[PDB]
Design a binder for this molecule. Sequence first.
Ligand SMILES: O=C1C=C(O)C(=O)C=C1O
Ligand SMILES: O=C1C=C(O)C(=O)C=C1O
Ligand SMILES: O=C1C=C(O)C(=O)C=C1O
Ligand SMILES: O=C1C=C(O)C(=O)C=C1O
Lengths: 98, 98, 98, 98
Amino acid sequence: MLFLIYRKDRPGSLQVRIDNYAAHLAYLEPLKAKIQVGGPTLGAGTGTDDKDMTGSFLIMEAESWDEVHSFVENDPFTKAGLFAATIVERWKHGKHND
Amino acid sequence: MLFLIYRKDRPGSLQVRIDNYAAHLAYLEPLKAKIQVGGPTLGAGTGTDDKDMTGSFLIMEAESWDEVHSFVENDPFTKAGLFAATIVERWKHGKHND
Amino acid sequence: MLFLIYRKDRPGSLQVRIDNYAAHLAYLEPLKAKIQVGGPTLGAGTGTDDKDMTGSFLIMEAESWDEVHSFVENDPFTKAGLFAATIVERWKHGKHND
Amino acid sequence: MLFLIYRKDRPGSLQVRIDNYAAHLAYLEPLKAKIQVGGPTLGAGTGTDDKDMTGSFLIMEAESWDEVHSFVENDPFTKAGLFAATIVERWKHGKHND
Ligand SMILES: O=C1C=C(O)C(=O)C=C1O
Ligand SMILES: O=C1C=C(O)C(=O)C=C1O
Ligand SMILES: O=C1C=C(O)C(=O)C=C1O
Ligand SMILES: O=C1C=C(O)C(=O)C=C1O
């Protein structure tokens, strides 16, 4: 069972993301087996550096919305108040293929 | 250059999705090389059938927002008025790995 | 200083909303002076009854994102795990008028 | 019948908003009777000037999703490719009051 987890940083908070980035990745590390796809959303331009990060997107396995809820609630990014938006959706790969 | 393309169906419009589903997939077919990840969002429960579809999510390569804009504008789903929400974000895979 | 606070219920959770609706309104009651606009989003059709509710939208005064964060975190609806999406934006009335 | 219409500008496109702002307001002018609430979302800080605008939010009367769809499709802002996100929801004022 897969979930899309989309979270967008509040304006002006890039430094909060940076300050908590190592802790965020350490929080994801034990969960890596459950994360199918993951990475930051990016802002203006073509840059792909740390300074270009504007949010977090993951596709993750979970047994329940309760599990997803706790995962989100316990993220260092969430606890730091980084995000202005959070969107979660149950999801599956298209079964033809795209 | 990758973009997240998230689109959520209007309420009560599952039959519109069904009616246009073959055309939508035919529209995606020539673009398949550019689509890294793709599939429907799903609603209540654990079902993964056609009746459980509530929207469309894709991660796709494009050279420009203009290209993404046209791709969205020309989708049979868009032309049928299926969606209540559309969210597009530039994005990259996390470069450690998750 | 005004914020849009948009929150959409998880699929299949209308009964959670109902179960917590009185508590939610009681939670908003002391804050009513700060809420400029408020009401539920509605689903398919033209109905405007309790059964048609699909989420919560408010425009509210706050002195800080920290205040908004706590307001959201302490809502009976949030504690019950009602929502799949939460979007917050600083906002102002257009100064001509619309 | 009321709809929330939420639209967020693409990154780096503040100047597109500025360039099209007069045309946007002229497009809204004949519709003003149908718009209950309207204004720009705002970004970082406490500023409320043109430079602080990051998107458009309206609450508007319409007889149909088809009407909302056309309204969005015909906006100078939409035609200019200003937006990264568009969210539309049927909505009503809470009938106690908040
Ligand atoms: O692969 C898919 C891609 C989509 O966009 C959709 O809506 C449904 C699918 O099965
Ligand atoms: O892999 C990643 C996953 C995230 O959630 C993030 O925010 C940044 C990354 O590089
Ligand atoms: O009133 C307004 C309405 C809008 O849609 C906008 O973008 C800016 C404003 O000032
Ligand atoms: O006024 C209201 C405010 C809310 O947040 C809600 O969910 C329902 C209502 O009727």
